[PDB]
């Protein structure tokens, strides 16, 4: 056959039933942990030092636009093995409502995906996290809308 | 691993343009010549890039952002698009727009790969985690 790959890769998806939070899973169909990477305490654990492609997506959904302007954020960070040092890698913010939804008109539904990814130097034993601010606006309706993964270079 | 590979970032010193810098991996044959990547030997390659545009308020005129990876082949001595995208960020608050590109391509030796944008004045060149350009031989 063909030689398998030793590249540390991972692909974890959101738990739809665990509302009020963003909890990653790997024991579902088309989720993946391979060649060293582990999912421990809702965090991806990096097995080998090197350059890594981090990629994630969180699909935000809503209906209408409230008076208070809502801000949705998404942030990825790492935690080093020794001294538990926190390093912030990626973060995004989007205001999906330009103006309040006028009464009398139908409060139409809106969908705002936030993509967040990049290439970063990671160390052994790093714990990668992907946190959002308001899980009230998440979209668990179907599979493939909220995912989190890393690919070594 | 003897596979040719490159991963270059922007040059913060060379403001006003998107000039690729190999030192700040470029090993095993892949040369950076005239801001382009030169394929050292034929075969399958994975070409990837990401740029991060940002602004400070939306001006009066409309804003269009383009990111394009182009190929000048020995078989075809003309700049040809491999991966291209367009964004329209403005329809007082700062805005941020990334653009992602990536795909697999069969290349030949001597081919030149460029990765260009249209608005360097909006490029967050310092964010090397989101302003890069690279290839890897499969």
């Amino acid at each position, epitope marked *: 056959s063909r030689t398998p790959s030793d590249k540390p890769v991972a692909h974890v998806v959101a738990n739809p039933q665990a509302e009020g*939070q963003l909890q990653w899973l790997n024991r579902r169909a088309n989720a993946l942990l391979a060649n060293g990477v582990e999912l421990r*305490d*809702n965090q991806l654990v990096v097995p080998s030092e090197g350059l890594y492609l981090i990629y994630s997506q969180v699909l935000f959904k809503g209906q209408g636009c409230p008076s208070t302007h809502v801000l949705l*954020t998404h*942030t990825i960070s790492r*935690i080093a093995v020794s001294y*538990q*040092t*926190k*390093v*912030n890698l*990626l*973060s*995004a*913010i989007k205001s999906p409502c330009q103006r309040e939804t006028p009464e009398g008109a139908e409060a139409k539904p809106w969908y705002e995906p936030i993509y967040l990814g990049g290439v970063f130097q990671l160390e052994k034993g790093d714990r990668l*996290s992907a*946190e*959002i*601010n*308001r899980p009230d606006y998440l979209d668990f309706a179907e599979s493939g809308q909220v995912y989190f993964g890393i690919i070594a270079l | 691993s003897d596979k040719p590979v490159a991963h270059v970032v922007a040059n*913060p010193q060379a403001e006003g343009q998107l000039q690729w810098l190999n030192r700040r991996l470029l090993a095993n044959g892949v040369e950076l010549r005239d801001n382009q990547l030169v394929v050292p030997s034929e075969g399958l390659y994975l070409i990837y890039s990401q740029v991060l545009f*940002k602004g*400070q308020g939306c001006p009066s005129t409309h804003v269009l952002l383009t990111h394009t990876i182009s190929r000048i082949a020995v078989s075809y001595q003309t700049k040809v698009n491999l991966l291209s995208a367009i964004k329209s960020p403005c329809q007082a608050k*700062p805005w*941020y727009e990334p653009i992602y590109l990536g795909g697999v391509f069969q290349l030949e030796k001597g081919d030149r790969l460029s990765a260009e944008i249209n608005r360097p004045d909006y490029l*967050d060149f*310092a*964010e090397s985690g*989101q302003v890069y350009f690279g290839i890897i031989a499969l």
Partner: antibody, heavy 121, light 108 residues
Framework: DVQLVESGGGLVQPGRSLKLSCAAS????????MAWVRQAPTKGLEWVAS????????FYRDSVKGRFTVSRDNARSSLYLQMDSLRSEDTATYYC??????????????WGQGTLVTVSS | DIQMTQSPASLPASPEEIVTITCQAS??????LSWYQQKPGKSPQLLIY???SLADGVPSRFSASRSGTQYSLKISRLQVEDFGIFYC?????????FGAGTKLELKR
């Protein structure tokens, strides 16, 4: 509108313990990283501790590595800080701020009134 | 640890002046920088986030720019309410580190 309120600061002896409270109102408390920031009299600002949304992750300063403990009750919209084994160095005025996150950036947006803590035998 | 060298420590000036405060970063911290103003007897207020963006409800006479590891805060037309101590904050790595501070004083 938006307002944070600190409570529970007072004079304490060396080696004693103390509990600080931060009352939040005017925003979604569950949608912000929370952090404590102290400054000593006639001195500058010093970061102390931070805590994530669900409180699962805590980050402390080396000066208080094993002594302080930050906690979070989102249902009560309150931020707590358990200051054990106090030292003379820990004498400072303590603030609780919101640690927000934008595009590849963070800041302390909303600041509390501040409570005063003194350590002298 | 990352250290933030802030200069000058003290700075005399008068209203309607142009004043520039700078911070120098030990390592690269990117846009994870914020400025703050603390008037006497009050709590600190957020001035600038994302290294160069004016915070919510901040008067427009404030500005900021960035170089590699050097970050500067600029007050265009100085007003009386703008006197106090200014701090710069880094937020990339733990421990989050503040600047030494800059005292703005009315010239005489």
């Amino acid at each position: 509108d938006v307002q944070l309120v600190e409570s529970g600061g007072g004079l304490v002896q060396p080696g004693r313990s103390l509990k600080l409270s931060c009352a939040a109102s005017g925003f979604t408390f569950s949608a912000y990283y929370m952090a404590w920031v102290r400054q000593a009299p006639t001195k500058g600002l010093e970061w102390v501790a931070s805590i994530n949304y669900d409180g699962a992750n805590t980050f402390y300063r080396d000066s208080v590595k094993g002594r302080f403990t930050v906690s979070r009750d989102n249902a009560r919209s309150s931020l707590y800080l358990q200051m054990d084994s106090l030292r003379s160095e820990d004498t400072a005025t303590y603030y609780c701020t919101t640690e927000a996150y934008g595009y590849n950036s963070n800041w302390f947006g909303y600041w509390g009134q501040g409570t005063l803590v003194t350590v002298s035998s | 640890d990352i250290q933030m060298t802030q200069s000058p420590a003290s700075l005399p000036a008068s209203p309607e002046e142009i004043v520039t405060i700078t911070c120098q970063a030990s390592q690269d911290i990117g846009n994870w920088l914020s400025w703050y103003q603390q008037k006497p007897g009050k709590s600190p207020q957020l001035l600038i986030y994302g290294a160069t963006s004016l915070a919510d409800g901040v008067p427009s006479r404030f500005s900021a720019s960035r170089s590699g590891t050097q970050y500067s805060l600029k007050i265009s037309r100085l007003q009386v309410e703008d006197f106090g101590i200014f701090y710069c904050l880094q937020g990339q790595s733990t421990p989050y580190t503040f600047g030494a501070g800059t005292k703005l004083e009315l010239k005489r």
